[PDB]
Amino acid sequence: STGSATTTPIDSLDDAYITPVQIGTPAQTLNLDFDTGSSDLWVFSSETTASEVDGQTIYTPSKSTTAKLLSGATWSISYGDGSSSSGDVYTDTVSVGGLTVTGQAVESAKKVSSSFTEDSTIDGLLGLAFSTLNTVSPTQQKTFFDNAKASLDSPVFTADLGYHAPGTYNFGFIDTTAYTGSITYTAVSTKQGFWEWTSTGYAVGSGTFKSTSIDGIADTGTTLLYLPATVVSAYWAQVSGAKSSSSVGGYVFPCSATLPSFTFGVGSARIVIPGDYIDFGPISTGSSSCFGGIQSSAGIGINIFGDVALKAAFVVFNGATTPTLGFASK
Numbered sequence: 001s002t003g004s005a006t007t008t009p010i011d012s013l014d015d016a017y018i019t020p021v022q023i024g025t026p027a028q029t030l031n032l033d034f035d036t037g038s039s040d041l042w043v044f045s046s047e048t049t050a051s052e053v054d055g056q057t058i059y060t061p062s063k064s065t066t067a068k069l070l071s072g073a074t075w076s077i078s079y080g081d082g083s084s085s086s087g088d089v090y091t092d093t094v095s096v097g098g099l100t101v102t103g104q105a106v107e108s109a110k111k112v113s114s115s116f117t118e119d120s121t122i123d124g125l126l127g128l129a130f131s132t133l134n135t136v137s138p139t140q141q142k143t144f145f146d147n148a149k150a151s152l153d154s155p156v157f158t159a160d161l162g163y164h165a166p167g168t169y170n171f172g173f174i175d176t177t178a179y180t181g182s183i184t185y186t187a188v189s190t191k192q193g194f195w196e197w198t199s200t201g202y203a204v205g206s207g208t209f210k211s212t213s214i215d216g217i218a219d220t221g222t223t224l225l226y227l228p229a230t231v232v233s234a235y236w237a238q239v240s241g242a243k244s245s246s247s248v249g250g251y252v253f254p255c256s257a258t259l260p261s262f263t264f265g266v267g268s269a270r271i272v273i274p275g276d277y278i279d280f281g282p283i284s285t286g287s288s289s290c291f292g293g294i295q296s297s298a299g300i301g302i303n304i305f306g307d308v309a310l311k312a313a314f315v316v317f318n319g320a321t322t323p324t325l326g327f328a329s330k
């Protein structure tokens with residue numbers, strides 16, 4: 001089997017991407033944030049505290065003939081941005097772009113933090129990291145991908161995020177029309193439950209490539225590119241007027257600037273992030289200070305190849321017995 005679904009930025013900045021997901025019988029379609037940095041499929045639901053729902057589409061398990069309460073199971077998750085959600089668990093039929101999994105754990109939110117409430121476009125998350133991170137207790141649950149794996153033509157999914165445009169998540173096959181050149185594969189460590197890999201270095205604009213190992217995770221659920229302070233300093237040093245602002249919470253730059261590209265290494269291959277991808281617009285409405293799309297990972301504890309990086313590539317998440325990541329230009 002295979003699946004193919006279009007993923008759409010939630011706003012003009014590509015702050016996140018939503019992908020339609022069919023849950024239950026008859027189908028209830030929710031727009032979920034596919035997140036290769038976490039491993040819970042959770043949704044706004046009929047059980048979510050009413051004051052914490054503001055515009056989201058909710059899953060109502062009582063209206064699904066295939067929904068079954070997973071007795072005694074609860075979940076609770078906190079994300080890197082400080083957001084959180086928790087609730088109980090159903091199993092139900094979940095379909096993504098024609099690919100169907102029965103008995104998928106669908107984690108029903110009883111509580112969500114303010115940032116989720118305030119984002120009316122995201123109805124939940126579909127986690128695509130390794131199932132070892134799944135927060136369901138006392139019986140850990142498998143991700144949609146893990147459940148689908150055996151049925152897939154090939155044990156892979158691919159992320160093809162658009163810049164200010166729709167893109168595609170495919171399951172079970174590699175679309176050879178979707179990228180240019182060849183896909184370069186690189187080793188993955190699953191030890192932290194992430195799609196963790198090691199970039200071979202970077203370049204800023206037309207500058208020389210710096211060969212240096214950068215261990216990080218491929219995370220579709222993180223907006224920006226978070227890299228070591230040395231790297232990030234070297235990037236923003238090429239932008240007149242750019243500075244790290246503690247009040248804003250990162251590097252900002254004059255909105256009048258033209259940003260240089262940023263290249264990262266994948267083995268001997270190179271992925272180029274155009275400068276425009278690194279512009280996240282005025283820090284506040286009407287401001288001439290713009291927020292940078294490349295930020296320091298200092299204090300995070302890990303480097304994160306978020307959407308800013310991933311949307312510059314066709315990315316293969318290879319879930320074979322020994323997982324790997326593949327990157328191609330496009």
Ligand SMILES: NCC(=O)c1ccc(Br)cc1
Pocket residue numbers: 016033035037038079080081083115116119122125221222
């Ligand atoms: N990885 C965390 C994530 O995907 C996320 C998405 C939307 C909000 Br609001 C907060 C967090």
